[PDB]
Amino acid sequence: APQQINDIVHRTITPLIEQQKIPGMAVAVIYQGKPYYFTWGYADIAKKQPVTQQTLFELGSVSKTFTGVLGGDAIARGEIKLSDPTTKYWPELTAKQWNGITLLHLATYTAGGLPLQVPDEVKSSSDLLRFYQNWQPAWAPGTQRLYANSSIGLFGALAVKPSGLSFEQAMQTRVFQPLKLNHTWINVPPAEEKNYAWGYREGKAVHVSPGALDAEAYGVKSTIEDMARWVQSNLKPLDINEKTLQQGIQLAQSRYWQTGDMYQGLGWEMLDWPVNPDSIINGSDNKIALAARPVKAITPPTPAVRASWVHKTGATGGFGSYVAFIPEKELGIVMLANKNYPNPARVDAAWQILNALQ
């Protein structure tokens, strides 16, 4: 890495790891389109395994960005429309409150109060159907944004129905493979377990538990190298040869709703560049990010804006991730850690790095 990058990275991340007592960490900086890597600490403390450029981290909700692009790809393929009723792709969902709830609403958390989690008791196909069937909205569709695994998770399960493929097959075939993300997994295969970091929660080694719609909402695992490639692909979607994927990425970065200074895309969230750092740093606190907020519709959606800060935070029990990029500056960061530490600390650090290099 250019010494400019070494300097700000080292000055910023070392204190962060100490303050937050993070066991292990990988960072990628994308500068003028090119990736530069940094690793610290332990993927497995007990077995003294270092974090490397091949270590898999749980991405948590950064997974939603893959889900959004896969949905955008299916739109571009003509398989689905965001204007379509949810019930078009789930005929067994006959509950009357679903009338007027479209795929857009599901993708962008504006259905009317779908909850943050699918309940842990929802295991089977029958349970899943009964959960959505019996759900009663707090608000009308397209009025309030309330961040929800149950909203975008359902979007992702339904977006892949016309293709005949499972969510996992569609993700592999249509996104991971074309982009050469050869070390990104929804399910980590036995040969890769050697590289799968443990997460740490109150000193305990932990991995994400299975739950309904996990793959869609929070279930991807990936390395710092594949995550840099993902950033490169979203920075510059026009270098992508596969046409519907190229469109899908553009669609995931369109602005569908505004709340405050933030715009909701598919998975991705966007703000105009230059940004108020306090706004993205403070707004990342779950006390704000997870509260209901009124949305204004963008009619019709604004196509991907090059002068944007595009980002997503993500967590699991034992992991904390963050991705941010500015297409106009060809500039991005990926931060992957095996402790779930506060969101504002991630955004703060990412801003310091990107602002110095901008």
Ligand X SMILES: *c1nnc([C@H](NC(=O)OC(C)(C)C)C(C)C)o1
Binding site for ligand X (CB under 6 A): 60-61, 117, 149, 208, 218, 286, 290, 314-317
Annotated ligand binding at 117? The verdict is yes
Q: How far does the chain reach from its first CA to its final CA, in angstroms?
A: 16
Q: Which of 61, 163, 233, 321 is catalytic?
A: 61
Cα–Cα separations (whole angstroms), residue 231 to 9, 111, 161, 257: 18, 29, 27, 23
Greatest alpha-carbon pair distance for the chain in Å reads 60
Annotated ligand binding at 28? The verdict is no
Annotated ligand binding at 241? The verdict is no
Annotated ligand binding at 61? The verdict is yes
Q: How far apart are CA 122 and CA 290, in angstroms?
A: 22
In a 3-state reduction of DSSP, which class is residue 190? Answer: helix
Of the pair 140, 291, the CB lying nearest ligand X is at 291
CB atoms within 10 A of CB 155: 33
**What is the nearest approach in angstroms of ligand X to the Cβ of residue 131?**
16
Q: What angle do CA 276, 281, 285 make, to 5 degrees?
A: 140
**What is the nearest approach in angstroms of ligand X to the Cβ of residue 117?**
6
**What is the nearest approach in angstroms of ligand X to the Cβ of residue 160?**
20
Q: How far apart are CA 186 and CA 168, in angstroms?
A: 7
Phi, psi of 228 (to 5 degrees): -65, -40
**What is the nearest approach in angstroms of ligand X to the Cβ of residue 149?**
5
- Contact by Cβ (8 Å): 160, 74: yes
Annotated ligand binding at 149? The verdict is yes
What b/e readout covers 136-149, taking b as 16+ CB neighbours within 10 angstroms? ebeeebbbbbbbbb
Of the pair 85, 317, the CB lying nearest ligand X is at 317
**What is the nearest approach in angstroms of ligand X to the Cβ of residue 186?**
14
Of the pair 35, 344, the CB lying nearest ligand X is at 344
Q: DSSP letters of 60-94?
A: GGGHHHHHHHHHHHHHHTTS--TTSBGGGS-TT--
Of the pair 232, 316, the CB lying nearest ligand X is at 316
Indicate if 61 belongs to the active site: yes
Of the pair 60, 265, the CB lying nearest ligand X is at 60
Which own/partner contact pairs does 172-178 have at CB distance under 8 Å and 24+ positions apart? 174/70, 174/73, 174/245, 175/66, 175/69, 175/70, 175/73, 175/245, 178/240, 178/241, 178/242, 178/245
State whether the Cα torsion 147-264-262-37 is positive or negative: positive
- Tokens at residue 177, please? 């493979």
Of the pair 76, 214, the CB lying nearest ligand X is at 214
- Contact by Cβ (8 Å): 311, 280: yes
Annotated ligand binding at 256? The verdict is no
**What is the nearest approach in angstroms of ligand X to the Cβ of residue 347?**
14
Shortest-Cβ-distance residue relative to ligand X: 61
Residue stretches of the annotated binding site: 61, 117, 147, 149, 315, 340
Residue stretches of the annotated binding site for a beta-lactam: 61, 117, 147, 149, 315, 340
Q: Give the active site residues.
A: 61
